[PDB]
Protein backbone atom coordinates (compact mmCIF):
# COMPACT_ATOMS: atom_id res chain seq x y z
CA UNK A 1 0.00 0.00 0.00
CA UNK A 2 2.94 2.37 0.81
CA UNK A 3 4.52 1.49 -2.59
CA UNK A 4 1.14 2.10 -4.37
CA UNK A 5 0.88 5.50 -2.58
CA UNK A 6 4.48 6.30 -3.71
CA UNK A 7 3.54 5.41 -7.35
CA UNK A 8 0.36 7.57 -7.20
CA UNK A 9 2.49 10.55 -5.98
CA UNK A 10 5.07 9.81 -8.72
CA UNK A 11 2.67 9.86 -11.77
CA UNK A 12 1.19 13.22 -10.63
CA UNK A 13 4.63 14.73 -9.92
CA UNK A 14 5.47 13.77 -13.55
CA UNK A 15 2.36 15.53 -14.96
CA UNK A 16 3.14 18.69 -12.91
CA UNK A 17 6.77 18.55 -14.14
CA UNK A 18 5.79 18.18 -17.81
CA UNK A 19 3.27 21.07 -17.53
CA UNK A 20 5.92 23.35 -15.89
CA UNK A 21 8.56 22.35 -18.53
CA UNK A 22 6.15 23.00 -21.47
CA UNK A 23 5.06 26.39 -20.02
CA UNK A 24 8.73 27.36 -19.40
CA UNK A 25 9.67 26.46 -23.04
CA UNK A 26 6.81 28.61 -24.43
CA UNK A 27 7.64 31.63 -22.17
CA UNK A 28 11.38 31.51 -22.98
CA UNK A 29 10.68 31.34 -26.76
CA UNK A 30 8.43 34.46 -26.32
CA UNK A 31 11.25 36.16 -24.33
CA UNK A 32 13.70 35.58 -27.24
CA UNK A 33 11.16 37.21 -29.67
CA UNK A 34 10.71 40.23 -27.24
CA UNK A 35 14.54 40.61 -26.85
CA UNK A 36 14.89 40.81 -30.68
CA UNK A 37 12.14 43.52 -30.88
CA UNK A 38 13.77 45.37 -27.90
CA UNK A 39 17.21 45.24 -29.64
CA UNK A 40 15.82 46.43 -33.04
CA UNK A 41 14.04 49.19 -31.05
CA UNK A 42 17.18 50.32 -29.05
CA UNK A 43 19.37 50.27 -32.23
CA UNK A 44 17.02 52.49 -34.36
CA UNK A 45 16.28 54.60 -31.18
CA UNK A 46 19.98 55.71 -31.33
CA UNK A 47 20.25 56.44 -35.10
Author numbering: 129 to 175
The article reads:
C. elegans SAS-6 physically interacts with SAS-5, a protein that shuttles rapidly between the cytoplasm and centrioles throughout the cell cycle. The presence of SAS-6 and SAS-5 at centrioles is essential for formation of the central tube, a cylindrical structure at the core of the emerging centriole. Overall, these findings led us to conclude that the segment between residues 125–265 contains two independently folded domains and encompasses all structured elements of SAS-5.
